[PDB]
Scaffold this active site. Structure first.
Site, PDB file in Angstrom:
ATOM      1  N   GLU A 177      27.361 -11.003 -30.412  1.00 62.42           N
ATOM      2  CA  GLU A 177      26.187 -11.543 -29.733  1.00 62.42           C
ATOM      3  C   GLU A 177      26.276 -13.056 -29.578  1.00 62.42           C
ATOM      4  O   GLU A 177      25.672 -13.623 -28.661  1.00 62.42           O
ATOM      5  CB  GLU A 177      24.920 -11.153 -30.493  1.00 62.42           C
ATOM      6  CG  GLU A 177      23.625 -11.542 -29.801  1.00 62.42           C
ATOM      7  CD  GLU A 177      22.415 -11.387 -30.700  1.00 62.42           C
ATOM      8  OE1 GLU A 177      22.551 -10.783 -31.785  1.00 62.42           O
ATOM      9  OE2 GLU A 177      21.327 -11.870 -30.322  1.00 62.42           O
ATOM     10  N   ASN A 261      30.666  -4.516 -27.020  1.00 62.33           N
ATOM     11  CA  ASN A 261      30.246  -5.024 -25.722  1.00 62.33           C
ATOM     12  C   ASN A 261      30.768  -6.434 -25.456  1.00 62.33           C
ATOM     13  O   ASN A 261      31.137  -7.159 -26.384  1.00 62.33           O
ATOM     14  CB  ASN A 261      28.722  -4.991 -25.624  1.00 62.33           C
ATOM     15  CG  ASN A 261      28.034  -5.873 -26.653  1.00 62.33           C
ATOM     16  OD1 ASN A 261      28.674  -6.619 -27.392  1.00 62.33           O
ATOM     17  ND2 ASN A 261      26.712  -5.785 -26.702  1.00 62.33           N
ATOM     18  N   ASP A 303      23.845  -3.560 -21.953  1.00 63.75           N
ATOM     19  CA  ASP A 303      24.042  -3.968 -23.346  1.00 63.75           C
ATOM     20  C   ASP A 303      24.188  -2.757 -24.273  1.00 63.75           C
ATOM     21  O   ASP A 303      23.412  -2.554 -25.208  1.00 63.75           O
ATOM     22  CB  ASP A 303      22.910  -4.891 -23.811  1.00 63.75           C
ATOM     23  CG  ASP A 303      23.098  -6.319 -23.343  1.00 63.75           C
ATOM     24  OD1 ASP A 303      24.134  -6.605 -22.707  1.00 63.75           O
ATOM     25  OD2 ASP A 303      22.211  -7.156 -23.613  1.00 63.75           O
TER      26      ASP A 303
END
Ligand SMILES: O=C(O)c1cc(C(=O)O)c2c(n1)C(=O)C(=O)c1cc(C(=O)O)[nH]c1-2
Ligand SMILES: O=C(O)c1cc(C(=O)O)c2c(n1)C(=O)C(=O)c1cc(C(=O)O)[nH]c1-2
Lengths: 595, 249, 595, 249
Positions: A177, A261, A303
């Protein structure tokens, strides 16, 4: 290992996450069967002394139980004859600045065990959230070596469990993130030196691809896609960290895992295909070279994260040919099955019939079919995106029954609304952002915010479901299957439930001090079978209770979705051990007293 | 009568005690017009002033805003400002443009989020070498639904301590800290003629003026008459803060 | 009250701390007895969400269960039919600066219940250590009134349980270590107004002495001793806070309690007798005038405290005349019995034969006989002085059996060592202090640091112990007695234990998550008997666990004496409920399920 | 040779960096000696230094200790000082001695623990009104095992802000903060001849000197002989610090 497999065969041990190298969480014990389930009452319990989420399962080896913890990453060793006495403990000293880099909660996912050769004694392998890896003596509790794999200052956090293959230990990474480039490392288990390291994006030298990469399926991609699919030097901060579960096959000598991701969260700032992100990898173990890789969601815009668990099996296909397969659930609502040897795709099915982000998946080419209406980047408000960013599956550990050939899994029921916006300011300054909301799905109750879970039994080759049942909140965790017609699971309400394998009817439920986000385990000590589980609530659904938040939009909308969890549970943490009739070590009260 | 001003806590422009430049300007213009000024407080940062202050009819005017803003009607301009280069002196290191090669060998740079400086960093080709540092200037928190920004105090402090070689900041925001800094610093205006590689034309210097609602028109006349009346006091105060000022074209 | 007594007569309720107005802690249930106690397994449990000590027992009224907690003193309500659901919760907020003024640990004792007349409904009364008293509605949970009693700035903290008598509530005080002058206050329960207040030291106007104070026993003291015994104006900072338990008698309309220790700790700075500190008081309710008082340890120099529990009974003395008695254990190793009506002294015996601070107590005069060898102020190392500061008894709530006429008590076994010193400095500056050490007594093992507790059965008139047994750690907490030959108690190791009433043999033990410093309770809901108890370690013995200290001389030497408790238990906090065969509301697993 | 002197962290008398008054005195003394000065540090406060360091041969000498002390041999004194009253200049509350009746009406006063000031407080019957305030200056924690005391900086801040009207303090401990105080605070020496209620003599002025171990007799004479070379440096240091030196008479 040539010794860890034999330890795995015995029913008195639980050596690794998944109980074996196939990661099926299957036991061959029948002392607790449908005849006697109403007599399952607790035997003994312990409290850790911490208030956060507790994940994973304990270890049981040679009459000892090893227990791991939340943020301070403590470790406890107990003897099964006299549980009340602690043989040794390990309490590290760590900078309290690593709490500011954790994404979601302070969690850990297990320990590792190495039996050892004649010279070097057995070892316990442990990871800390600061980014340190340590090995401890399994009988006394000192430190043999300790090294570092992640840097706090850049923003790299380590919450994954170690995994031991032959004479080496494998370590992952987390923190995508913040825009952290992902990598996988292998270490020698005796000394601590580095053997090999691999990346997810960059020049082909860093990826360590083999000379026969994807030779059976040329249309997946061959070479030069680690930089070509990106524009400029974006791959230096692309992301793609793995923090899930591994699988290992000795015959092919391969390790199977997945990747997370990409970064950043805006799909416009990274235009391309973002190759080798959200990709299933099968790699080698001695040299680390990659044998095959398949892409699930190219150029993700919702996401998601493909770091779930994979389960190996052997089955006969539609044509009647025996084949070795791996099955993998995903967060986008599709479950895949692939050939373990070469990477061919056998089937891809829909978890629930209310998925509207993908219409279907084409097997011949491997490209999914998209629905433009229910997609992002639409420049206005989008409604009813099912599933949400949480997905229909997460870090839990499902179960497999080989005699029946069924998969037992827990599924969420959550849907999302996405609202983009842009706000100007004084000097050429604008702020772009998105407001996200989650709510229950069509089969639940949106007015009262309840009905957010399901549990299912599934068959991969045919594709049909034997049965499916509804729950109150999501099954954030895993299941576990036994030999005699029984499956176990836990719920965030604070319940342990035992169900039926062939019909799904409710058979047993008990109340524990706090909700569980782990998976149950079972063992035997002396002619008696015990079932153990952690308790303690946390994680993403419990972020609103740990930090005491009231804004519905906090945590991307998790606070609003789980607003009714406060009047059913509170925080806690510890371990509980059940047995038939509650009989245990202290049946004679004159054991373990003074003098 | 009375005057109601849309206010939010944002140092050093506006403070609770009323010692900021914007608060002083508002009080001075209110005194010049002869009406008392009431400072209603909104919890949200300044970027939320227009949406929840004026559209909700709670307050009336905003002390400082960009000109030619289509959202609300704006009064006549009263001061211009731009972005400035901040460098640490006695290092024989003088920077005058973004085309200077020596900017690519500096260890780090400090630039705010959602700013043309970030676009310049991406253009020159050094954004990937400063992303972690920029996220570390503040704590590693930046939600996609909430507004975050690095305060000027951290910027000037890290420039002074020598961690960052050069910084790019806004004029009015960093005047007090550089003026009161113990270590001697150097501020230099950025040329307004900035050329992008693609060809986009975005300036570096802007006008600023206060605005009122769309329907109201008499309030604009009162405000700009008062602003015409209070030219010298405003200019003296602005020179007292020592901010760089550019002539109105 | 004229409804509270009848509520206590019914066996479905536990309405006040002590279960009745005599503080006997006795039930009349025979479902669980010596015949079937080995089949006792847990029914259900809860975790609160805080990591500190937990004292007191929950309340059960009208089919609902009320539970309290330590700092920040939350409150919960639960339904017996469906324990999982939380009907209402209250979460106060107060200044974190109250943490630094507590002596020992952040604890609380209990709650109170008022049934209500036709107009005003039932109420729940609670206390908060910032110095606040609150009343809440028992059904909805809203607040009716809230008042302030203490001052944090001066150093006053409120950790005592409330007490409801008739149409009034009684509140004590704490903080005697810092020089706080103690007082007792009475309030109205409907409105919250102040009725009367009494002080421990000072002139007779503040004392509230009736016209016939100590008329039967003039040698105890009659008048003018509030200020006569002290020198100067020291009584302003004397002390005497009460933080223990009360008892009530409706026939004589009296309340009985005790008073704390004098201040400061140095005995050379307060010459005199220091009257009305460490005194048993019997006072009136409506007016508050003191009917009688008796002092126990004049001019204390060992830091004792007379705040222990008081029990009421009816017995025949040696002469054969029926009399009404109150029994009180003390910290100095002497147990007293007195006549309720007038205060005449019946007997005073020794808790153990290893006490060397008092040779005997004179019944004719009331003055103890002291041994100069085992005292302070000798200006040299004085050894083997016990009972120590922790004493042979403390804040626990012991039990009494009406039929057998026995008292079941828990005792400590600790002996201490005292060493004074004086240090000069620069310019006419000197510092005077003492070093204290603690260790097990002559009946334990000093080398291994084990054997610090005992449990005893005692008779008052005869003065002989029926049985006495010894344990590994001190029995910090109380006991609960049942009709059929059972005694229950809890242990710091993390055990619930049940013994025999006529022999002392061990019959049952179970391992709970963490140790207990409260007392258990029992009740019935639907023909089924349930036993509930709290868990969570803390208090004075657990200091080393809570604040993580290592110096053996810290905590007045308590850290060194309990250095072995770290490897037997950890923190926690919550409640556990046992029943026969572990049967409860979730026998049918379709209760409490969604839809 | 190395002096090897013992030091403790007692601000402002001694700090880790080496800017404490005792550190300057020791460095000047060693420079006069002709040998470099060495520091040995104990984590415990200074009150223990004599017992743990000097008698166990860990260190060599101490810096500042009262003369005619039976514990160890003392050198010739080099300065003298006593307790002082501290008040605010604006309040016009002039105090000359403990016999002033006006000290009864004062709301609060600040003194140390174990000092003659506490004895004077007990002699005038004001201890009961000040015990809680004194215990609240430091956090509410004064165990009977360890040594606790009020920070001089806290005392000066409390008297300056307005919580306590009058203070009593020792000179060298608070001289630095008295000199560098923005608020105008005035100080006054206490009379030497003071009588308590019983009439016992208790002085208010003391000399200060340097201590050596009993066995070391050559070092004592050497230090006495070679300290006579450097009066002016010590005098200048005292004047720069601001300690109210009282000449011996
Ligand atoms: O990108 C990452 O590094 C990262 C890390 C983690 C994590 O470490 O738990 C999660 C996620 N992403 C994530 O997207 C997610 O849904 C998630 C849930 C949880 C949890 O503990 O329940 N962790 C994470
Ligand atoms: O003088 C006081 O105010 C006071 C208060 C308390 C308390 O409220 O816990 C204790 C004591 N003294 C005390 O002396 C003591 O030994 C003690 C033990 C405990 C406990 O909770 O275990 N409290 C207290």
């Amino acid at each position: 290992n040539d010794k860890l497999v034999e330890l795995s065969k015995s029913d008195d041990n639980w050596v690794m996450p998944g109980k074996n190298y196939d990661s099926n969480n299957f036991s061959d014990l029948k002392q607790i069967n449908k005849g006697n389930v109403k007599q399952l009452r607790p035997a003994w319990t312990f409290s850790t002394g911490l208030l956060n989420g507790h994940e994973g399962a304990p270890l049981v080896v040679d009459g000892k139980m090893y227990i791991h913890t939340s943020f301070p990453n403590n470790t406890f060793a107990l003897g099964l004859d006299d549980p009340g006495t602690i043989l040794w403990q390990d309490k590290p000293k760590q900078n309290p600045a690593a709490r500011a880099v954790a994404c979601c909660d302070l969690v850990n996912r297990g320990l590792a065990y190495w039996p050892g050769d004649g010279k070097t004694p057995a070892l316990i392998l442990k990871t800390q959230l600061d980014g340190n890896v340590a090995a401890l003596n399994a009988e006394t509790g000192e430190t043999v070596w300790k090294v570092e794999n992640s840097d706090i200052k850049v923003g790299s956090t380590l919450t994954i469990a170690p995994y031991v293959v032959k004479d080496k230990v494998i370590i992952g990474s987390s923190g995508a993130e913040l825009g952290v480039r992902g990598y996988l490392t292998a270490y020698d288990v005796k000394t601590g030196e580095q053997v090999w390291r691999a990346y997810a994006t960059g020049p082909d030298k860093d990826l360590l691809l083999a000379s026969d990469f994807n030779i059976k399926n040329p249309h997946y991609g061959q070479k030069g896609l680690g930089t070509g699919t990106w524009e400029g030097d974006a791959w230096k901060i692309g992301g793609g960290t793995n923090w899930g579960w591994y699988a290992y096959d000795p015959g092919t000598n391969l390790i199977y895992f997945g990747t997370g991701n990409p970064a950043p969260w805006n799909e416009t700032m990274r235009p391309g295909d973002n190759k080798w992100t959200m990709t299933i990898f099968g790699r080698d173990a001695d040299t680390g070279e990659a044998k095959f890789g398949y892409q699930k969601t190219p150029h993700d815009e919702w996401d998601y994260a493909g770091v779930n668990v994979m389960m190996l099996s052997e089955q006969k296909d539609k044509d009647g040919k025996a084949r070795k397969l791996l099955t993998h659930p995903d967060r986008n609502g599709i479950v895949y099955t692939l050939d373990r040897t070469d990477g061919a795709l056998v089937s891809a099915n829909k978890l629930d019939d209310t998925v509207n982000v993908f219409k279907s998946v084409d097997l011949k080419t491997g490209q999914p079919v998209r629905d433009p209406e229910y997609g992002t980047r639409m420049d206005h408000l989008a409604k009813d995106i099912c599933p949400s960013a949480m997905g229909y599956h997460n870090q839990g550990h499902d179960s497999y029954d080989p005699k029946r050939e069924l998969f037992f899994m827990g599924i969420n029921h959550i849907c999302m609304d996405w609202e983009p916006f842009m706000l100007p300011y004084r000097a050429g300054q604008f702020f772009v952002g998105a407001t996200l909301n989650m709510y229950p799905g069509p089969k639940g109750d949106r007015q009262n915010y309840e009905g957010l879970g399901q549990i299912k039994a599934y068959n991969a080759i045919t594709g049909d479901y034997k049965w499916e049942k509804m729950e109150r909140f999501a099954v954030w965790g895993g299941t576990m299957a036994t030999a005699g017609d029984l499956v176990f699971y836990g719920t965030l309400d604070g319940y342990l439930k035992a169900r039926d394998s062939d019909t799904g009817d409710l058979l047993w439920k008990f109340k524990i001090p706090s909700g569980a986000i782990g998976y149950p385990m079972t063992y035997t000590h002396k002619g008696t079978q015990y079932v153990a589980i952690y308790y303690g609530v946390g994680g993403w659904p419990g972020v609103g209770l740990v930090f005491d938040l009231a804004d519905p939009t906090a945590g991307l909308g998790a606070v609003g979705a789980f607003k009714k969890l406060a009047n059913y549970t509170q925080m806690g943490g510890g371990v509980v051990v059940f047995s038939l009739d509650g009989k245990g070590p202290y049946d004679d009260p004159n054991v373990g007293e003074w003098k | 009568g009375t005057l109601r001003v849309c206010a939010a806590e944002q140092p050093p422009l506006s403070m609770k005690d009323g010692s900021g430049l914007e608060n002083r300007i508002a009080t001075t213009v209110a005194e010049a017009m002869g009406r008392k000024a009431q400072f209603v407080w909104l919890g949200k940062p300044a970027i939320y002033l227009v949406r929840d202050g004026l559209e909700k009819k709670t307050c009336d005017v905003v002390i400082g805003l960009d000109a030619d803003d289509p959202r609300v009607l704006t009064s006549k301009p009263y001061y211009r400002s731009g972005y400035v280069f901040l460098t640490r002196a006695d290092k024989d290191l003088d920077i005058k443009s973004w085309s200077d090669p020596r900017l690519k060998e500096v260890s780090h740079m400090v630039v705010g989020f959602g700013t043309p400086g970030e676009a310049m960093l991406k253009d020159i080709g050094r954004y990937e070498e400063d992303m972690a540092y920029l996220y570390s200037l503040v704590n590693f928190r930046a939600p996609r639904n909430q507004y975050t920004q690095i305060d000027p105090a951290r910027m000037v402090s890290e420039v002074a301590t020598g961690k960052a070689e050069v910084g790019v900041a806004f004029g009015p925001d960093v005047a007090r800290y550089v003026r009161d800094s113990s270590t001697k610093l150097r501020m230099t205006p950025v040329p307004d003629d900035t050329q992008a590689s693609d060809g986009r034309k975005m300036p570096q210097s802007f006008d600023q003026a206060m605005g009122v609602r769309k329907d109201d028109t008499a309030l604009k006349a009162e405000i700009d008459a008062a602003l015409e009346k209070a030219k010298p006091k405003i200019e003296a105060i602005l020179k007292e803060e020592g901010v760089p000022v550019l002539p109105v074209s």
